[PDB]
Ligand SMILES: O=P(O)(O)OC[C@H](O)[C@H](O)[C@H](O)COP(=O)(O)OC[C@H](O)[C@H](O)[C@H](O)COP(=O)(O)OC[C@@H](O)[C@@H](O)[C@@H](O)CO
Ligand SMILES: O=P(O)(O)OC[C@H](O)[C@H](O)[C@H](O)COP(=O)(O)OC[C@H](O)[C@H](O)[C@H](O)COP(=O)(O)OC[C@@H](O)[C@@H](O)[C@@H](O)CO
Ligand SMILES: O=P(O)(O)OC[C@H](O)[C@H](O)[C@H](O)COP(=O)(O)OC[C@H](O)[C@H](O)[C@H](O)COP(=O)(O)OC[C@@H](O)[C@@H](O)[C@@H](O)CO
Ligand SMILES: [Cl-]
Ligand SMILES: [Cl-]
Ligand SMILES: [Cl-]
Ligand SMILES: [Cl-]
Ligand SMILES: [Cl-]
Ligand SMILES: [Cl-]
C-alpha cells in the first residue's frame with residue numbers, strides 16, 4: 019500500500035526536454051507500483067508547452083499545478099513532500115536524468131543499512147553546474163561520516179531521504195532566500211539523522227547543463243550554523259565546533275561570491291555584503307576556527323573583523 | 337600667419353643650446369612658414385646662455401623674463417601670448433628635432449584636421465623615459481585616448497592647434513613644479529577630438545644629461561576636474577573610463593609611487609597619503625572598475641587613507 | 654680578594670650536576686684565585702641534587718633558599734651579595750666550562766681593562782650566538798659592529814665593581830629575558846668589552862604583561878645610558894634591539910599561531926604599548942624587511958601583523 023520511493027520534480031517552462039527526464043524516471047528496474055513521480059509545475063507560462071509534455075503521462079504520474087510562480091524550487095518541493103506518504107523521497111531537477119537502476123540500487127542499499135540518507139554518484143553532461151567528486155572516491159560506504167566522506171561538499175537534495183525523519187522533525191524547504199535553501203534542507207536532515215550511505219556502482223544521477231546585498235543568503239547561512247549547534251544527534255559542543263569549522267571551510271572554498279572583495283562590485287555593495295557575512299560568522303563560536311583549514315586563517319579573521327582591505331589582501335595571498 | 341611656432345624656455349643651458357637651436361633652424365619646412373620663440377627664465381650663468389642666443393639674433397624671436405619663475409609654465413605662457421601661428425610645438429632646451437619634424441607633423445595634422453599631432457620620441461642616455469606603446473600601431477590619423485595609450489604620453493612635446501588653446505583659454509598653471517605639462521595636455525585633450533600619431537621617424541629626441549604633496553595633488557585634482565567637465569567627452573560613463581585610465585597611469589608612473597615602503601619619515605608618509613586620499617576621494621568610485629585590476633587593493637588602500645594597507649599593496653605588486 | 658666568583662643556581666639537577674661542578678673545579682686557574690658559589694633554589698627531588706652538592710663540601714660555597722623563587726634571578730642576586738671577587742661568571746647548572754675558561758678570560762680582561770669578557774660558546778644537542786665570534790679575538794668590541802645585542806646571556810665574565818657601583822640586580826618582573834635586561838644594564842653602564850674565541854670556553858648542554866615590562870626596561874636602560882649619551886646613538890642601539898626582538902623574541906610568530914584570539918590581542922596590546930614608548934627615530938635603524946611588521950605592531954593591528962608574517 020505504502021510506496022518505497024516518491025520522486026519529487028518541480029517544473030517551470032522546461033518544454034520538450036522534460037520528455038527525456040520523465041522517461042528516465044518511468045524506465046526504472048524498480049517495480050513501477052513500488053514508486054511514484056510527483057510533478058509540481060510552478061505555473062509554467064510557455065504557451066502550454068510544458069503542460070502538454072506532462073499531459074502525455076497523465077495516469078503514470080501524480081501532478082499538481084501551483085496558481086502562481088513561487089520563483090524557487092522550495093514551494094514546489096514542499097508541495098511534493100505533503101503529497102508523498104512513501105518510505106523515501108528523491109528530489110529530481112526537471113532537466114536531469116536518473117540511471118535505470120537508481121531507485122532500486124539506492125533503496126536496496128538504504129534498506130540493507132537502515133540508512134536515513136543514500137547518496138548516488140553524480141555524472142554530468144556539458145559545462146556549467148559542477149558535481150561533487152571527493153564523496154565518491156572511497157567507493158561504497160554503508161555508514162558514512164560527514165567530515166571523513168566530504169558530505170559538506172555534496173549538500174544538494176538530489177539524494178534519497180527517509181520520509182519519517184522529514185515528518186518527525188517537520189523539515190521543510192525555507193523561502194527567505196533564492197540560493198542555498200537545498201544546503202539548509204540537507205544540513206537540517208544530516209543534523210537530525212545518523213545513518214548515511216554512499217553508492218558509487220553507477221552514475222545514478224546525471225546533472226544535464228544546457229546585485230544581491232546578501233541579507234537573504236547570509237540569513238540561510240545563519241540557519242545552517244543554527245542547525246549544527248542545535249543538533250540532537252551531534253550534542254557534544256566540541257563536535258559542533260568541528261562541524262561548524264568544516265562548513266566554514268566549504269563556505270570559503272565554494273560560497274556565493276567567494277571573491278567579492280577584489281571584484282568589480284560597487285564599494286557600497288561590498289560593505290553591505292561583508293557586513294552580513296561578518297554579522298553571521300560572529301554568531302559562530304571562535305572555538306570552531308581551529309577546525310577551519312589553516313590557509314583560510316587570515317581570510318576568516320578578516321571577515322570576523324569586518325575589514326574589507328584585509329579580505330582583499332587575504333584573497334591576493336590565497 | 338605662420339604654420340608653426342616652436343616655443344623653447346631656457347635657463348642656464350650654456351653651449352649645449354647650439355645643438356637644440358640648430359635642430360629647429362635645420363627643418364625641411366620652408367623657413368618662412370615657422371618661427372622659434374626663445375623665452376629665457378632669467379639665466380644667471382655669467383651670460384653664457386644669453387651669449388649662445390645672441391648668435392641667432394634676427395633668426396629667432398627672443399624674450400628675457402625679469403625674474404626666474406622656477407618652472408617652465410611662465411616661459412611657455414609667454415611663448416603662447418607671442419605666437420599667432422596655426423600650431424605651436426613646445427621644445428625643451430636640451431632636446432633635438434628631426435629635420436622632417438615640423439613638415440611631416442604639420443602636413444599629417446592639416447590632412448587629418450588634427451587638433452594634436454604626436455611624433456615618435458627617441459631618447460639619448462638614461463634618465464627621463466619616453467612613451468613606446470602609443471607608437472606601436474604605426475601612423476594613426478584619428479587616435480583614441482584609451483586604445484592608443486595617450487594618457488601614457490602627456491608631455492607637451494607635441495604639435496597643438498593654437499585655436500583650441502585660445503578659444504578655451506588653456507594656460508600652464510603654477511600650482512606645482514611637477515605635472516603642470518600633464519594638466520595642460522589633459523585640458524587640451526578634453527577640449528578637442530582629432531588626435532594624430534606619426535611614427536615614420538624619431539621626430540623628437542629627449543636628451544638626458546646631469547614634498548608634502550599639497551601642490552602636486554592640487555594639480556592631480558585639476559586633471560580629474562578637466563575629465564569630468566569635458567565638453568567633448570560628455571557621457572558620464574566615458575568620463576569614468578577616462579578617469580580610471582588616468583588613475584592607472586598615476587599608480588604606474590606618479591611622483592613617489594613607492595612612498596609607503598620608502599625611507600620617508602612616518603609623519604611625511606601620513607601627510608602625503610592624506611593629500612592623495614583627499615584627492616582620490618573626490619573621484620567617483622564608478623571609475624574604479626576601469627582601473628587595471630592589479631591596482632585594485634592599492635587604490636582602495638589610498639581611498640581608505642590606510643598606510644599599512646598601501647605598504648602591503650606595494651609588497652604584493 | 655678572589656679573581657673570579659662563579660655563580661651557579663641549581664634546581665632538581667640531580668646526578669648531571671657532577672659534570673658541571675667538575676668542569677669548574679678542573680680549571681688551569683690557581684684553585685685559590687677563584688670560588689664556585691652554588692645557590693640551590695629549594696630543590697625538592699628527594700635530596701638527589703643536595704646529595705651531589707654535599708660531595709664537594711669544603712671545595713664550594715653553598716646557600717639553600719628557603720622557597721623556590723621560580724626563576725634564576727633570586728639565586729643569582731644571592732650569589733652577587735656573597736661574592737667579593739674582581740669578576741663574576743654566571744654558569745647554568747647543566748653547562749660545562751673549558752679547563753682554560755677562567756684563566757684565559759680573566760687574563761684577557763685584565764690585559765684590556767675589560768668590564769665584560771665574552772668567551773666563544775659551544776653547544777651539545779638540539780642554539781648559541783655565532784656572529785659575535787666571527788672576527789676572532791676583539792680587545793675593545795662595539796655593541797653594533799660585534800653583534801653583542803645577539804649575545805645577551807649572562808654566561809660571561811662581568812667586572813663586579815660596575816655591578817656594585819650601579820647597583821645592577823636581576824629583576825623578577827618575568828620568568829624570561831631577565832638575563833638580557835641585566836647584560837643590557839651592564840653594557841649601558843660600561844665601555845670596555847672583550848671577545849675571546851681561542852676555544853669553546855662555555856658549552857651549553859641541551860604572561861606578556863610581565864615579558865613586555867622587561868622589554869620596556871631594556872629600552873629605558875638604553876635611553877638613560879650615561880655611557881651612550883648621544884640621542885642619535887640611543888636611537889641606533891634601540892633600533893638594533895628592535896631588530897633582535899623581531900628576529901629572536903619570545904612568541905615572534907604569535908599572530909598566525911594556534912594561540913586563542915583573545916590572548917593574541919592581549920599579547921599584541923602589550924607589545925604595541927611597549928614599542929610606542931620607543932621613539933620612531935629608532936625605526937630607521939631597524940632592518941628594512943621588518944618595516945611592515947614593526948609598523949603593524951605600532952598600529953596595534955593583529956591582521957597587519959598576520960599579513961606581515963605571511964610576507965616574511
Ligand atoms: O581538506 P579541505 O576540507 O580544506 O578541502 C576539501 C577537499 O579538498 C574537497 O575534496 C574539495 O573541496 C573538492 O570537493 P569536490 O570536488 O568533491 O566538490 C565540489 C563542490 O563541493 C561542488 O561542486 C559545489 O560546492 C556544489 O555544492 P553542493 O554541496 O553539491 O550544493 C550546493 C548548491 O546546490 C547550491 O546550494 C549552492 O551552490 C548555492 O550557492
Ligand atoms: O594601462 P594598462 O594597465 O592596460 O597597461 C599599460 C601598458 O603596460 C603600457 O604599454 C605601458 O604602461 C605604457 O607605458 P610606455 O611603455 O608607453 O611608456 C610611457 C610612460 O608613461 C613614460 O615612460 C612616462 O611614465 C610618461 O611620461 P610623460 O607622459 O611623458 O609625462 C610628462 C612628464 O614629463 C611629466 O608630466 C612628469 O615627469 C611629471 O611627473
Ligand atoms: O638584521 P641584522 O643585520 O641586525 O643581523 C641579523 C643577522 O642574522 C645576525 O648575524 C644574526 O641574527 C646573529 O644571530 P646568531 O647566529 O649570532 O645567534 C642567534 C641568536 O642570537 C641566538 O639563537 C639567541 O637569540 C641567543 O639569545 P641570547 O642573546 O643568548 O638571550 C638569552 C636567552 O637565554 C634568553 O634571554 C631568551 O630565551 C629570551 O627569550
Ligand atoms: Cl563527522
Ligand atoms: Cl542575498
Ligand atoms: Cl540569529
Ligand atoms: Cl556528538
Ligand atoms: Cl553557497
Ligand atoms: Cl610641470
Ligand SMILES: [Mg+2]
Nearest residue numbers: 327328956957
Ligand atoms: Mg588592515
